[PDB]
Amino acid sequence: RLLQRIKQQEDKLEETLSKIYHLENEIARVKKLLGE
Amino acid sequence: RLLQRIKQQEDKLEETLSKIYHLENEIARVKKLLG
Amino acid sequence: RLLQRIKQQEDKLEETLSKIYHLENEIARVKKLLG
């Protein structure tokens, strides 16, 4: 159970980071938009 | 507890994803506003 | 493995949460700097 759960958590965290990267990029463009 | 630590991490991750979901909505709204 | 992998995941998630925090702050500044 634990080995699989951990592998799943590692996969989920990587996909979670991907999401954050995208948002950080969204935030960057929005700020570029606003002029800063 | 390797067992409790993992359930802890799982719960944490779920809440983190809930936070991200909300932020996705916020930035999308801000983006629509800016045009 | 397992113990060294849960620790690494816990650190990773803490770093991620920090990113989320800064994100929330950035979106709170960008937005309602127009409202």
Tell me the torsion sign for CA atoms A16, A17, A23, A25: negative
Name chain C's partners: 3 or more CB pairs within 8 A. Answer: A, B
Chain C residue with minimum CA distance to B18 = C20
**B13, C13 contact by CB (below 8 A):** yes
- Residue A13 is nearest to which of C1, C12, C30, comparing CB atoms? C12
DSSP state of A35: T
Whether residues C10 and B9 touch (CB distance < 8 A) is answered with yes
C29 touches chain A (CB under 8 A): no
Show Cβ contacts of residue C19 under 8 Å, excluding neighbours closer than 6 positions: A20, A24
State how far the Cα of B15 lies from the Cα of B18, in Å rounded to an integer. Answer: 5
Structure determined by: X-ray
- Resolution, angstroms, 1 dp: 2.4
End-to-end CA distance of chain C: 50
